[PDB]
Amino acid sequence: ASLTEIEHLVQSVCKSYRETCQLRLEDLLRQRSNIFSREEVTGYQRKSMWEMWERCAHHLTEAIQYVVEFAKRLSGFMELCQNDQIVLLKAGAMEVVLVRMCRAYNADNRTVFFEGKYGGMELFRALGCSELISSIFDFSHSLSALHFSEDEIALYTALVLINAHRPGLQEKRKVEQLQYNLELAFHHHLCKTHRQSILAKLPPKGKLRSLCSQHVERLQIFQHLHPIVVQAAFPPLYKELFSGGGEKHKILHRLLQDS
Ligand SMILES: CCn1c2ccccc2c2cc(C(=O)NCc3ccc(S(=O)(=O)CC)cc3)ccc21
DSSP states (O other), X not given: OOHHHHHHHHHHHHHHHHHTOSSOHHHHHHTTTOBOOHHHHHHHXXXXXXXXXXXXXXXXXXXXXXXXXXHHTSTTTTTSOHHHHHXXXXXXXXHHHHHHXXXXXXXXXXXXXXXTEXXXXXXXXXXXOHHHHHHHHHHHHHHHTTTOOHHHHHHHHHHHHSOTTSTTOSSHHHXXXXXXXHHHHHHHHHHHXXXXXXXXXXXXXXXXXXXXXXXXXXXXXXXXXXXXXXXXXXXHHHHHHHSTTGGGSOHHHHHHHOO
């Protein structure tokens, strides 16, 4: 590539990300005074473990659906073969959401936006996976300390998705070329904006792996305890990405073909 081509890459990633945001940043900032009462928190903790899991998996699936749309609008993603598109989404959709999630987190009061209002991690006690929850909160805290801009989140989440080290890729070099181009783009925008100091503060890639792995493992425990709940009330797409052997569902293929 070259300079104008890299700066055009920057604008197009930023555009693709704006169009496939679930929630505008300003909508989430305007809502930060809107915080679950202690009575509403108590109501969340008294919800059954299985209904809370169903509600969280539903919200997570909705978030993942915008990540699929981000990828379909991302330069060069749709020139990749369908196997590689699917491998990249299967490994990275959760990761992209974990990163996008820091926009919904308030580091002043350590709350996250959830079902209309903001609540600390005690909101999620009924899940019985406090470790996974505090890790997600800790991770979102550390990303909020960096004061990402929206443009930076778009360029970083594009690299989270386009990772040429995902096992199972069939055109690894083609993904490597794509990755390298987005890294140049990311790093060029940081240099232009005097923000390269964040490079050494970004999370190691192992951290995102670790968070997804925790998620999948707690899902497995839960699915052993409530196998019919998962079968009957979790979203098909969620099951395709996260449970075993839930990829009998082929939703991603459908999402990727549909214009
Ligand atoms: C860490 C606690 N925790 C979970 C733990 C386990 C499973 C699911 C969740 C979970 C889901 C949400 C959620 O989906 N809330 C609505 C929402 C909409 C748009 C945005 S966004 O615009 O930043 C783009 C994704 C952000 C949040 C929030 C917090 C959550």
